[PDB]
Design an enzyme around this catalytic site. Sequence first.
Site, PDB file in Angstrom:
ATOM      1  N   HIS A   1       0.786  -1.411   0.236  1.00 39.86           N
ATOM      2  CA  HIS A   1      -0.026   0.510   0.580  1.00 39.86           C
ATOM      3  C   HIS A   1       0.366   1.279  -0.201  1.00 39.86           C
ATOM      4  O   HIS A   1       0.671   2.782  -0.316  1.00 39.86           O
ATOM      5  CB  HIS A   1      -0.961   0.389   1.072  1.00 39.86           C
ATOM      6  CG  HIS A   1      -1.977  -0.837   0.914  1.00 39.86           C
ATOM      7  ND1 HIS A   1      -2.624  -1.071   1.892  1.00 39.86           N
ATOM      8  CD2 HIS A   1      -2.545  -1.669  -0.058  1.00 39.86           C
ATOM      9  CE1 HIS A   1      -3.629  -2.004   1.660  1.00 39.86           C
ATOM     10  NE2 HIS A   1      -3.808  -2.272   0.543  1.00 39.86           N
TER      11      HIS A   1
ATOM     12  N   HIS B   1      -9.470  10.112   0.692  1.00 40.40           N
ATOM     13  CA  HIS B   1      -8.783   8.823   0.181  1.00 40.40           C
ATOM     14  C   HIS B   1      -7.308   8.905   0.985  1.00 40.40           C
ATOM     15  O   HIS B   1      -6.544   7.243   1.039  1.00 40.40           O
ATOM     16  CB  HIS B   1      -8.354   8.534  -1.351  1.00 40.40           C
ATOM     17  CG  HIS B   1      -7.371   7.206  -1.284  1.00 40.40           C
ATOM     18  ND1 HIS B   1      -6.437   6.993  -1.367  1.00 40.40           N
ATOM     19  CD2 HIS B   1      -7.584   5.354  -1.661  1.00 40.40           C
ATOM     20  CE1 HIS B   1      -6.099   5.577  -1.431  1.00 40.40           C
ATOM     21  NE2 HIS B   1      -6.548   5.236  -1.874  1.00 40.40           N
TER      22      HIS B   1
HETATM   23  O1  LIG Z   1      -4.643   2.726  -1.843  1.00 39.86           O
HETATM   24  C1  LIG Z   1      -5.402   1.503  -1.781  1.00 39.86           C
HETATM   25  O2  LIG Z   1      -4.092   1.289  -1.249  1.00 39.86           O
HETATM   26  C2  LIG Z   1      -6.517   0.607  -2.263  1.00 39.86           C
HETATM   27  C3  LIG Z   1      -6.079  -0.916  -1.647  1.00 39.86           C
HETATM   28  N1  LIG Z   1      -6.910  -1.414  -2.251  1.00 39.86           N
HETATM   29  C4  LIG Z   1      -8.732  -1.003  -3.052  1.00 39.86           C
HETATM   30  C5  LIG Z   1      -9.562  -2.032  -2.970  1.00 39.86           C
HETATM   31  S1  LIG Z   1      -8.969  -3.713  -2.111  1.00 39.86           S
HETATM   32  O3  LIG Z   1      -8.361  -4.370  -3.533  1.00 39.86           O
HETATM   33  O4  LIG Z   1      -8.742  -3.860  -1.090  1.00 39.86           O
HETATM   34  O5  LIG Z   1     -10.709  -4.194  -2.838  1.00 39.86           O
HETATM   35  C6  LIG Z   1     -10.651  -0.885  -3.058  1.00 39.86           C
HETATM   36  C7  LIG Z   1     -10.981   0.265  -3.227  1.00 39.86           C
HETATM   37  C8  LIG Z   1      -9.967   1.367  -3.622  1.00 39.86           C
HETATM   38  C9  LIG Z   1      -8.117   0.880  -3.193  1.00 39.86           C
HETATM   39  C10 LIG Z   1      -7.680   1.457  -2.197  1.00 39.86           C
HETATM   40  O6  LIG Z   1      -7.535   2.334  -2.938  1.00 39.86           O
END
Ligand SMILES: O=C(O)c1cnc2c(S(=O)(=O)O)cccc2c1O
Length: 438
Positions: A102, A327
């Site tokens: 992440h 976000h």
């Molecule tokens: O910023 C991030 O690293 C991140 C990680 N995952 C996301 C997922 S999911 O892969 O967990 O389904 C779904 C929608 C947004 C996400 C996101 O913004």
Amino acid sequence: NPFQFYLTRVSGVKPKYNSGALHIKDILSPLFGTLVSSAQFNYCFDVDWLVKQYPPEFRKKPILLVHGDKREAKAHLHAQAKPYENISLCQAKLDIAFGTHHTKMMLLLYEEGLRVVIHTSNLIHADWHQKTQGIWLSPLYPRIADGTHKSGESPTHFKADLISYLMAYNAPSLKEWIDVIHKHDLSETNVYLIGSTPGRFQGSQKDNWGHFRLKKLLKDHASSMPNAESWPVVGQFSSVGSLGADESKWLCSEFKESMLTLGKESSSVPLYLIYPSVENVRTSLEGYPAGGSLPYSIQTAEKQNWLHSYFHKWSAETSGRSNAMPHIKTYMRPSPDFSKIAWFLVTSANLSKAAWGALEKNGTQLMIRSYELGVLFLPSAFGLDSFKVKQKFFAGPMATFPVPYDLPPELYGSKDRPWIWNIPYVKAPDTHGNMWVP
Ligand SMILES: O=C(O)c1cnc2c(S(=O)(=O)O)cccc2c1O
């Protein structure tokens, strides 16, 4: 400002709310440095879009994409990048189940020096379009003269800590960036690095990552004040993991305990959690599709309804961003009247055990699943006892910290619900006239 904390530009707010903001094209602009090479650490990439965000004169400079994708996701990313001969990829090892990469970071090597960018946005158009995202911009770090022996270290140990974070990948492409960082002077850095890397840490390594890293920094570099028990903790995030059957399992036992730490001495401290309600998402600039980036599943949520009593609405009049869904992730320690803060953290880490770590093995081992990265603003690092909270995020002493959303946070009303992304919302349409049918 000495803090160099920015929000991303939001399409659709009035110019006053984008004046101090940064689009990715601004960050990569020649005005910030003459680009030689860059590394983009992220989770989700649109490589075609990404290359277009670099100035045309820099678009063929080497780019390293640092990602955690595996199997067909990995194949898709390689296929995205194959048309661009200057793009290399580094797959971050994820040897613990359900781990992810992440960390959102740019390493920008210039003719003139080096810059580090730690931020919260994926490298896709929608993450920079109408969301509230956070950015920390390092100073321009000059190169240490060849033959000169100096540390180039800051009082916050940022240079060593960033190298330590990169060393955890065990990646050859990142050893090259470690060598670049070694050759630059990072001594002006006034923030502390807080990273998570996957692993099981005990003993001398327990304090290196996750919420134990935060705890150690707050013990070592913050001061406790009288009536510290009245200074709330604020957590602000865009995803929620499974925290357990009640608050004592992780949230209020080990997580809140780390966040409460101040000073070296040995709880009714209020905990505010900020997470968009359904109504926040419905009335947002994006409408219900903003919920596509707020991935709280019904399966997780129904196991922990106790959590939602901690939830507060997203509200950001101070930066004109109440309708720009968050976000960014932030954590901070405001005073009882929210006029000051004892520290502020911007990070990729959501409210999850995967990101922050969960104690294992009779409290002797901290298990982290994911890579995360953020920066911690401590008053001591600026020669202060606390930060004053800036009243208007984009207003005009420069020793007041630009908190990007409204204080005090507002509790959910009785009819509010946390945004849950995989159930339908068909009672009321969004700002584009649509319902949400997953
Ligand atoms: O910023 C991030 O690293 C991140 C990680 N995952 C996301 C997922 S999911 O892969 O967990 O389904 C779904 C929608 C947004 C996400 C996101 O913004």
